[PDB]
Amino acid sequence: LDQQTINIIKATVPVLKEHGVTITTTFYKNLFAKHPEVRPLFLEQPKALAMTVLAAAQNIENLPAILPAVKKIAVKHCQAGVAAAHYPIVGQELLGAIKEVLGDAATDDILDAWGKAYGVIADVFIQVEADLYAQAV
Amino acid sequence: LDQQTINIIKATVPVLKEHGVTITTTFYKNLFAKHPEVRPLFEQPKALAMTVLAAAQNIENLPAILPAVKKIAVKHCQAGVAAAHYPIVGQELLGAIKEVLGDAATDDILDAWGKAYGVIADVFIQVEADLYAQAVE
Numbered sequence: 001l002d003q004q005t006i007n008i009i010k011a012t013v014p015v016l017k018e019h020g021v022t023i024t025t026t027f028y029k030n031l032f033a034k035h036p037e038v039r040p041l042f043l044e045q046p047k048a049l050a051m052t053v054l055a056a057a058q059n060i061e062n063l064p065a066i067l068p069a070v071k072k073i074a075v076k077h078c079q080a081g082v083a084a085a086h087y088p089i090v091g092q093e094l095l096g097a098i099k100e101v102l103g104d105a106a107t108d109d110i111l112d113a114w115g116k117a118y119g120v121i122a123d124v125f126i127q128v129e130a131d132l133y134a135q136a137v
Numbered sequence: 138l139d140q141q142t143i144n145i146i147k148a149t150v151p152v153l154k155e156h157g158v159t160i161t162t163t164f165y166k167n168l169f170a171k172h173p174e175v176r177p178l179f180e181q182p183k184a185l186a187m188t189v190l191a192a193a194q195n196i197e198n199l200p201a202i203l204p205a206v207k208k209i210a211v212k213h214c215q216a217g218v219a220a221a222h223y224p225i226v227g228q229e230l231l232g233a234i235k236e237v238l239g240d241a242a243t244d245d246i247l248d249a250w251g252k253a254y255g256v257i258a259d260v261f262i263q264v265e266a267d268l269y270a271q272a273v274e
């Protein structure tokens with residue numbers, strides 16, 4: 001991530017957190033409708049993905065600070081059969097959710113910044129899980 | 138880390154690696170001579186500088202070396218390594234890189250390495266802080 005990029009995430013994350021419920025519900029609704037293939041891996045409905053990414057983004061400059069949580073989420077992901085190739089589809093639906101919510105405020109840069117941020121955050125998950133999948137055998 | 142910093146790091150690590158033995162021995166030499174107080178914490182230690190260079194080659198995807206970072210963090214926490222020790226190691230590491238760069242040790246290049254050591258040290262410092270916390274519950 002560049003500095004400017006970090007800067008956009010820092011300025012905008014609090015507006016995303018304010019509309020958290022909408023982002024979360026829109027994300028999951030779009031995820032399951034558009035990518036029916038991942039439904040099987042998941043009142044008990046999942047709700048923490050989007051806010052967890054925002055929490056990561058709030059600390060975009062110190063991602064190691066969320067390792068203790070990432071480590072635990074990873075155990076659950078490896079247990080469910082989450083693959084590296086799933087990450088782009090989740091990112092796509094998260095970004096679409098962010099876009100709908102930002103509405104008019106949805107500038108390109110803003111979107112592109114979020115696209116990058118998600119990338120870096122997803123990378124941490126992907127590595128930690130790759131490493132646990134390898135540790136399993 | 139701006140891109141120019143990253144470019145300097147990627148271009149120069151190979152020179153530093155070729156000069157490994159020198160950087161390593163000058164680093165430990167000056168570390169213990171200038172900072173006798175850390176001596177007790179440590180058939181001699183040898184891995185530090187080469188490990189930072191390795192982290193630097195990976196500076197763009199630090200998560201990839203977490204499994205090493207993690208295991209090193211345990212040793213550091215077992216040894217009583219503190220966040221305030223990082224700047225002193227950084228100072229002696231840069232002294233060594235400066236010596237080996239000789240004529241190529243431009244200001245710009247040293248500043249880049251300074252920056253890079255900073256980012257890498259920040260990762261270890263956070264991991265170890267989480268491990269120190271984890272020891273008390």
Ligand code: HEM
Nearest residue numbers: 038041042048049052053073076080082086087090121122
């Ligand atoms: C950076 C991106 C992601 C984040 C931040 C994330 C976050 C989370 C969180 C917080 C949990 C619940 C852990 C708990 O409290 O038990 C979870 C579980 C789960 N995630 Fe993710 N997720 C990410 C990407 C994905 C991907 C790409 C998929 C692939 C479909 C996925 C599938 C699941 C599944 C199947 C569960 C388990 C539900 C359960 O039984 O708890 N996640 N995720």
Ligand code: HEM
Nearest residue numbers: 175178179184185188189209212216218222223226257258
């Ligand atoms: C980013 C900076 C650092 C890196 C990459 C690093 C790397 C390492 C490595 C690779 C080991 C050996 C682990 C093994 O094979 O068991 C080690 C051990 C240790 N490091 Fe560091 N270290 C760093 C900073 C520091 C600092 C700031 C201090 C404090 C003076 C320090 C003190 C030690 C000590 C006392 C040990 C244990 C001696 C031993 O290995 O038996 N390190 N470190």
